Each structure stands twice: as structure tokens, then as C-alpha cells.
Design a protein around this ligand. Structure first.
Ligand SMILES: COC(=O)C[C@H]1c2cccnc2C(=O)N1C
Ligand SMILES: COC(=O)C[C@H]1c2cccnc2C(=O)N1C
Lengths: 229, 229
């Protein structure tokens, strides 16, 4: 009994001009764009109520993709920052019949290697949580704290340190209020969990796979080019 | 005026039996083993006084490599843990004429992408430092601290968090005493910097390139397979 959920993929900030240095979400990953493979991670899930991609209105790459003509993929307008784009995605879900108590998953457009196991694991562990949570991976590299002169002040106990991944799973109404209030407050919002944390909540960490990586350099594609199929 | 230095490559812990799942230092990286490309990062440096690789006495892969028959590559016996193997490397340097005040660089055998720029940068910034230091990279992923129930207690300020890389550069005599004393003390030694930290010193962080990665999975090879030449 996995819970029903909506999905928001923030994918705005793309200029109106096509560039040789393409946005990472439109790079080729074994014959398909990154973002097309990212949507593949959700679109077939039986509990998906609907998916919204947040895009710049003048995105020049999106209208060429198959998913741009799919009724299973809704569209929302990008914001001034990622939080505002996520916010617009929430508003789009509200037009599509979403309820304040419905679960929403926000996921990076450049994380195309999300396995069904991780997705279902996140869904089952948080289904009856009062706030929600996020996929995350234990820190494996040795972590040093820097003093003001650039010298090691301490080696951080990485046994309690987790790298924050996506999807991040929260209730629609609460995430809507956290994001909206944190924006007007001037909070430096990174991910959705950072907004819930500012609003006073403690998101649950759900352990995922480390190879659910975000494509931040074209070099990161090379790690994934043998991961499909 | 870059300082003269010795190099220690800890590369022991290899069983006597060849295995299909080879040690990472013996995997192929564009036609050469990882460790052969790692040695390439130091062997031609004009200020290198000598290089010691720490190896299991019964290492079945090493005698097949070109560098196993190179007079420019010295050999030391592996220890019970990495620290002990590094320690044995220091003892080998002392037999080769090394002085207590000589700089020593310890580097991971599975970091074959160390560029000459990083190496020279480390050498010039620490040449007149009282203790030494290490290459390191700023943390770029969002970092969450976990409470005892697996919920986020805080988002760590990653502006002060650095991932510890190699080489790590310290004086021979001091590193010898730190490692020896920390072993008998029972300290959980990770890298050489962790031993200097326990001995009371604050290593200087020197910023390096992020793609000086350690090969921990065969997937990590894919990121580097286009990096040579
Ligand atoms: C430089 O591009 C980004 O940072 C992308 C980011 C962004 C910026 C501004 C508005 N919306 C967004 C959005 O959805 N993102 C995923
Ligand atoms: C599982 O292999 C390792 O952890 C490798 C490690 C090690 C272990 C035991 C003794 N010496 C060493 C050494 O030099 N290392 C680099």
C-alpha cells in the first residue's frame, strides 16, 4: 500500500537562446535527454496522481521532446529562483485537483538514475510521517572543518553527516506555506527540506543509493552512460 | 623554488591470490593500470628525491608492471593497516637517505588524476609551513546532520566543510612520531592529517581540483576514461 503522490520537477532557469553549452537537463544520455530519462523514473508509477515540470516560458529545447506532447506531463511556469518555480508547480497541482494533505515529491531534473527501489522505499517509509522526508546518502569522504585561517579545526564526525539527495517528499499544504513564507522572510532556501527545517520541522532521512547522482558537469554523464538500460 | 620532497604511495592490503574483482589500483585506465598512472603524477617531478610504494610481500599483480622493474620506484612492506604501511614507507625513506626535516607527500594509489598544477600548488603553499597540509575540495552537496532518530537536526554550514584529498604533505620526523604514537594510543587513524591533528597540529588546507578523484568503484573509472592523455 504505497501512498498516492504528485511529482514536481523544477527545470526552469533556461534562457530563450539555444547554446552549444546546453543546459544539463538537455544533454544526451544514451540516445535520450537527461530530463526525459528523469521523467521515466516516475511516469509509469501506479500511484502517481500527476507530474508537473516547471519550465521557462521560452524554453527552446523542451518543445522538441516527446514528453512535451504528452498528456501525462503537465507544465508550470518558472520562477525567479528554484523555490519560486517549485512554488509555481504546487499552484499547478492545485489546479489539477491536488489536495492540501496530498504527498508531493520534488526531484532534480538532472537526476536521471533514480531507481524504482529508492522511489518506493521513500514512499513506504514516509507514508504515515507527520512532515515527510528526503532521500539521502551517508557521507563517505573524510570531512575537515576549516578555521578562519584555512587550517583544520577538526575532523567532522561523518557518522552523522548525510548528503541530501532527491526526491524530497512533503505534504502539499505545509510545503506550500513553508516555501512561501521562507521566500518573503528572505531565507536562503536550498532544497525543499531547508524550507521545512526553517518552518520548524525535522525531515526524516531515508537512505538511498549513492549512484542517484545529479549531472552537474558533462563528466558526470560518463558515470551514467552504462547505466541504461 | 619548489621544495624537494619524498613520496609514499600506500598500496598494500592486496591478497596473495589474483581475483576477477581486482584491487582498484590494478584496474585498466585507458591501457595502463591505475597505479601506474598514479606514479606518473610524481616520477618526472624535478624536485622528487625518491618514491616508495608500500606493497604486500606476495602482491601477485605488481611484478607484472613496468614500474616493478624501475630503479626510480622503491618498495616497502605493507603493514597491518594503512597507517602501519605508511609508517613502513617512512622507514624505507630513512634507509634511502631521507632527513627528519624533509617533506614527505603521502598519496592514494587509486588517485591517478592528480595534475601537475595541484602538486606544484601544494608544494609552493606549504614549503615554509611549520606543520604541512593537504589537498582538499570545498563541499558542494547540501549536508544534513542526523539526530538519533534519523531526522534532520540541522543543515550544516558547508561554507567551512572541506573534503580531504591527497597528497598530504608533512615533515618526515613529525609524521613518523604522530603515526607511531597514534597507533600505540589506539587512535582511529584515517589519513595522515588525522594523525597530525591528534598530535595537536592544524594542517593547512590547500584547495585542489575536484576531479582528483579516488577510484572506489569500477564506475569511478568511467569518469576518468577520457582524462588521458
Ligand atoms: C542556473 O539554473 C538554475 O539554477 C536552475 C534552477 C532555477 C533558477 C531560477 C529559476 N528557476 C530555477 C529552477 O527550476 N531550477 C532548477
Ligand atoms: C582493503 O584494503 C585497504 O584498506 C588498503 C589499505 C591497507 C590495508 C591494510 C594494510 N595496508 C593498507 C594500505 O596500504 N592501504 C592503502
Amino acid at each position: 500500500d504505497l501512498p498516492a503522490f504528485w511529482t514536481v520537477i523544477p527545470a526552469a532557469g533556461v534562457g530563450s537562446r539555444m547554446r552549444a553549452d546546453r543546459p544539463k537537463q538537455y544533454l544526451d544520455l544514451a540516445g535520450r535527454t537527461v530530463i526525459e530519462r528523469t521523467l521515466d523514473c516516475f511516469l509509469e508509477h501506479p500511484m502517481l496522481r500527476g507530474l508537473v515540470v516547471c519550465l521557462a516560458e521560452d524554453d527552446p529545447y523542451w518543445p522538441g521532446l516527446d514528453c512535451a506532447a504528452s498528456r501525462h506531463v503537465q507544465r508550470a511556469a518558472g520562477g525567479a529562483e528554484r523555490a519560486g518555480s517549485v512554488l509555481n508547480g504546487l499552484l499547478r497541482l492545485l489546479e489539477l485537483g491536488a489536495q492540501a494533505d496530498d504527498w508531493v515529491l520534488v526531484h532534480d531534473a538532472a537526476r536521471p538514475n533514480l531507481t524504482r527501489g529508492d522511489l518506493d522505499r521513500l514512499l513506504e517509509e514516509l507514508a504515515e510521517d507527520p512532515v515527510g522526508g528526503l532521500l539521502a546518502v551517508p557521507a563517505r569522504d573524510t570531512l575537515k572543518r576549516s578555521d578562519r585561517d584555512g587550517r583544520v579545526s577538526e575532523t567532522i564526525d561523518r557518522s552523522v553527516v548525510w548528503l541530501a539527495y532527491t526526491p524530497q517528499m512533503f505534504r502539499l499544504g505545509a510545503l506550500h506555506r513553508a516555501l512561501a513564507d521562507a521566500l518573503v522572510a528572505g531565507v536562503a532556501i536550498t532544497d525543499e527540506a531547508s524550507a521545512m527545517e526553517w518552518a520548524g520541522y525535522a525531515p526524516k532521512l531515508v537512505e538511498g543509493r549513492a549512484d542517484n547522482l545529479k549531472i552537474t558537469t558533462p563528466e558526470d554523464l560518463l558515470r551514467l552512460q552504462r547505466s541504461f538500460p
